[PDB]
Design a protein around this ligand. Structure first.
Ligand SMILES: [Ca+2]
Ligand SMILES: [Ca+2]
Ligand SMILES: [Ca+2]
Ligand SMILES: [Ca+2]
Ligand SMILES: [Ca+2]
Ligand SMILES: [Ca+2]
Ligand SMILES: [Ca+2]
Ligand SMILES: [Ca+2]
Ligand SMILES: [Ca+2]
Ligand SMILES: [Ca+2]
Ligand SMILES: [Ca+2]
Ligand SMILES: [Ca+2]
Lengths: 161, 161, 161, 161, 161, 161, 161, 161, 161, 161, 161, 161
């Protein structure tokens, strides 16, 4: 599953970072699909603003998914992003397909956004500790996006009016 | 799974169309993931042109996925697009995660694109027959995109030089 | 009210389609005016999201108004779009000028959008049966926009939180 | 028909200005519809240039219509812009639906453009006199657009070659 | 002249549609050339507006030419668009190279745009009857453009002032 | 604090307008900061739509701040816009830093937007009476923006659903 | 030199405004040429910044020149803007063609910009006194541009470091 | 009037080319002002098409005016473009300020555009003969624009229908 | 075939340049159609890159075809660009409609691009010699585009790996 | 002043970072107001270049202010950016409102830019030390902008010619 | 070669970082020239795709070159990027000027991109270790670009079909 | 170093123009590096305007470098643009790396821009004499850019205030 590269990151670093990148890739792809799931099916008084907001989140996730995947490839590995892989390697709770109210989707999204945000933020440190600054930076950009999206979601529920 | 709408498409036709739209949604989301899987992992002399071409395909699939999903919702149904749904409801063979050569990706992609192209093309007629002209037209837009993408792939292998 | 054209749609077809286009033209012009009426006067907690949403609807309706009007003219007819014509030939229930609450506008708009959506959707079939495929396609484009707008409105009231 | 606002314009100025804004709103919406009525149906040697010019006028009118309506609302009033209100409140002579010649449309348009131009220009002074400088400015911007459009029309008939 | 494709349109449908697409391709390429011929050589008081209008037509034809040619290829065929093919397979009467006055070009264009508009419109139905919904849609888009163009030309001569 | 200019507005008019401009400059800079204060800290069901609306407000305020400051300079004065000046010359009540609910920020912002809208509106007349028509016009533009923003805010609370 | 218009500004207002507009038109066209004259021939340490600044000035003048000319024509007059008219009717002192130092051009330009700025500013009031609010407004927009340009010029010489 | 440059065009070529450039500068500035004069004052059936066309001409002339002037400066000279210089050094017949009919403007413009077109075209050869290829190219770009604009004008009068 | 123009190129230069331009016009229109023929039908491993490249070539060719044709008209001639003329006046070997391999299209295109590249290059000199500098420059621009396009084609076959 | 978040940064990291972010927020907002203060009031030979440069700085600061403020909120805190807070928590020496010469502004600005640049650069380390990689990155982006702006300023005074 | 700055990075950090930035600057400038050398001279079946790809690489390298150079200057140093310096300080093996095949250029480029990629990636850590977070971040962005480009290159040679 | 082409430029014209193109290529790449060297390191009162001006120069140079290099390759040759070639084949005096003052950079840049401007201008004539009109035109475009850039630089020193 590896290919040769002149990239001189140590071999053990490449192995551990490819694993870490793929773990994050599965999480973020799953979250991308969850985001559209919610976007299509939400109903209630805040429909249009939340509907539109979720498209923005998906667009951001798409960029980070690409950057994460391509990083695994750059350092000699394979990127694993098919449905069969994602369903197995993502730890996100299956997103309910029988919820509709904006509030139910917000609380469901907060759980999952929170899980992915916390994963990616930790992965910054794991990459830094492994000696892979570029990978750490990639997770840092992704984490900034995820922590902002998590805030946009939580801000809707942190007060009731 | 249903919500009331003033849309007066006959009730039985809504039911059959929601099912048809979800069948096609599962296929097109799966094909979207497959397209990126190939994009990241392709290697060989035609790397960059094919890499970029596949991003074009993904952007068009994303637009047809949204159109199909929202159509299901418009006529009073639920769009089902989570990883857990897609992995069960897509009939596309799992994309191999251990291929790299551009030619191997082209052959694997032609198989999946051909399957989705033919499914969506048949769905146009199923929708027209059922009396849902907007759904037929949504499938027609999708089919035109799929048949063009299929050609782009096949044109790479229909001659050898 | 007619002018000569090399367009060889049968004369009966032209006559029936010119009337059908004018019927839809009236309905859509009126819906455009209604849409702005609500946009200006809505008040309540969802003000800005709904206010901006209605501008998007108007922009889409304008494009369909033009397309329907110009089709009547293309096939040798006159397009009837003055206030005096619209107030008589639009079958939309007069929109109230004494409502303000966003909820009240949403409910009223759902009534009006449903009416036009269902008119245009059937008109696809009238045109197709008449053997005017271009006019049927014009109505199909307009119908897709109307069904999506109807959904955007209905989605606000289909759940309560 | 009123909602309270912190805008400290005196009650009498608010009520007089709301009425004046609504008078001009009805005239400009009607004129907007007239402009497209002519745009669709004009025929003759200068067709394309005039056809396009009238879309320019309509775009400008739309912006002024919005600005006038929204000013009535800002100062605590209701904007009245439905077909039923416009047909009663506009003083423009019903535009003929049985004229085609570019020249005939030019002459008929000049009549109505003249009427609205002169109405809006006078309304600048009425607002200024009422001590509502923002409304006067809104009318000044609309009047500049109207006087320029009137010129564009008249310039076509002021000489014969 | 054929190449293997996964596209599952029946063999006879492919053969007949490739022929129909090539017939329409020859007519539309010829019409494109005709359009520029007129564009360059027109003279008279309406010169600039008609000159520009005709570039708009050519841009539209170019897009329909490509879509039609590529459809023939997508379904396993060859697209035939060389000068030698077009001069043989177009049925448009050779365009006169010794006319100048805007009126004479408008009349000569009406003849040829009418012929192509009517061919394309009938071809929608031929494609639909053959069970090729994408091809039918391609001709529908092309027909819409052609009927609008025919009107823009005819609208210049349907009245004389 | 003054510099010579060939601008021949009367000396006493320059002095009184510089003062009036600076008074308005202090209020508008303070309002700009207040607007972002609200934007960052609001929480509740209408979060994203109101968050984004307030960025629109701030962008409009920035342009008017610049225009007011630069006018004071053009006519030979100094623009005073530092935090120390603003905290002393603004009469806006200090914005609470312990509120979060969207409703609470809307009412707080209505207070301050109203205060500024009414100041700027009065300042049009003060400038006109002083014989500085450009300064009056600058205040007119700022006032139209302020009255519209004030409406956007008040419209959220003028009805409860 | 006059043509008939439905514009109902009083006849004596038209006559006096047409003269005032043409007087301003002459000065502003002259200032436009002067601006470029300086732009081409300036030399010295601040060359590129001042060179580019002067192109910004010319672009704004051009817009006002057109608005002033077209206003004269809209109200039934002739716009006079040929070289022979401008050399006779411009109130500006002929610009020297034998200066080069940036400072020399700045000083010369300040004289000319001051004259035009002061003329246009006065003309706002002359128009307002004549009851022509649109013309007053056109001069206000022009005066705001000229006063700001005058400042940009003077600011370069109001301190020496 | 000269400043030193490292540009090693021979001194006599500089002197001759500076003179030639200034001759062409005066003609093109004069033609620019003439173009706007016609633009503002034309009246008749072709108003809007020709009005707009003349703005395109003026935009192009502006670019060539700049290029020509700057070339004189680049090779050590002064650019002479004030009203007082242009009225003396342009040999264009003063443009009439008492014509209105579009046909009258077309024919007057044709005479002036013909004069400048033919001057600039000859000047290409004069520059090439003097050994200044860059100046010859500047005149070639200007000449191409002028010959095309001359055609746009002439094409209007070369036929009558 | 000829119309009067003030363009003072000698009568014999005009005649010979019109013929020369039309010879090049036939070649370049033929090449434009050839480029699309290859674009549609090519197949093999380099498909997408070469497919897209050929669209770039076509766009450049279209611009030069227009410039060549319009130059013929500007100098009082007729542009001849119909299918019947091009098939007669182009000396390009008819393009084969039974080739597919990318390599075969590259070789076939190189023959035709070379022929046109070399005709246009020679035509620069023919125009210079005739004293038509603008026409020479028109051919210089076209020739630069053709020699670049020829290189892009040849570079594909000048090495084998 | 805290709200709950799923963001799993340690509670002490959140507290510490919210304080640090707010410290930098006060400094950067104060600097933003200082930058415009200079922008408006500067006078001297380098006026327009430095005037424009300072608007570039303010635009960059605005983005960093937003990012810093929002990060404090994301991690469960309150952002404090009112005039009253900034005047108390910014340590920048109050900016003089009685200086004009470009040089004096440059020297004053360097002091304040220096102080903010140095604070923000240190805060990268303080954030790293607290285990908040996203916050550190936010300060890194701000620090890069500040160090660059500081150079732009200092570069004006580091040599005298 | 140093200038005073308020930037308070420690003196030894400045000296060592200036040297490190200049070592990277020479490598990246050399690589930029190498990239264009390949781009112009490559020949073979993948010409156009690789030709374009290398322009993308060059545009990225230019941005990083500027960032690196400016950082050295910002911290009080001199940026050294002349040909004479680059040829002395780059360690990249001189690029062969006698290769043409795409494959030969790919292999040659991989060697040089690998060297620079590895140098920059190590330099991130050298900067972090010296306590210069902004410089580390600049190298991180550059390293990310380099590692991605290295992959784009290697991906072409990592498989043979 | 040569590759076969259908380009019919005479053999010795190809050889001599390849040499001449490579001579100018070395000069212009070296000037491009010089321009950036000045850009980064300049300091003094005119810093920002001159800093920015030099990026405009570099962008123009980059386009000419590409056009020159590609021309050499188009006509069958090799483009030589590596650091090792440029250092040997450029005759520009090594640019000083110990200068900072704006004036020092202007003087040094004037020397080198002058040398390159004069080389390229002569090269137009050498290409024309050899019969290569396209190469001559390429040098004409570059010469126009260089003569303009040289002026921009010399205008800063041609007068002292
Ligand atoms: Ca990618
Ligand atoms: Ca969607
Ligand atoms: Ca229309
Ligand atoms: Ca609105
Ligand atoms: Ca195509
Ligand atoms: Ca400003
Ligand atoms: Ca105008
Ligand atoms: Ca210029
Ligand atoms: Ca053309
Ligand atoms: Ca924000
Ligand atoms: Ca830079
Ligand atoms: Ca290139």
């Amino acid at each position: 599953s590896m290919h040769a590269t002149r990239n001189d990151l140590p071999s053990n670093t490449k192995t551990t970072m490819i694993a870490l990148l793929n773990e994050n890739l599965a999480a973020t792809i799953d979250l991308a699909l969850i985001t559209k799931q919610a976007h299509w099916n939400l109903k209630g008084p805040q429909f249009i603003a939340v509907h539109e907001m979720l498209d923005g989140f998906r667009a951001e996730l798409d960029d980070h998914v690409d950057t994460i995947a391509e990083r695994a490839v750059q350092i000699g590995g394979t990127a694993y992003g098919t449905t069969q892989v994602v369903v197995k390697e993502s730890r996100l709770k299956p997103y309910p397909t029988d919820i509709y109210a904006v509030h139910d989707h917000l609380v469901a999204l907060i759980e999952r956004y929170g899980d992915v945000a916390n994963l990616v933020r930790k992965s910054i440190k794991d990459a830094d500790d492994a000696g892979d600054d570029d990978t750490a930076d990639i997770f840092t950009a992704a984490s900034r996006s995820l922590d902002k999206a998590l805030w946009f979601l939580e801000a809707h529920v942190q007060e009731s009016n």
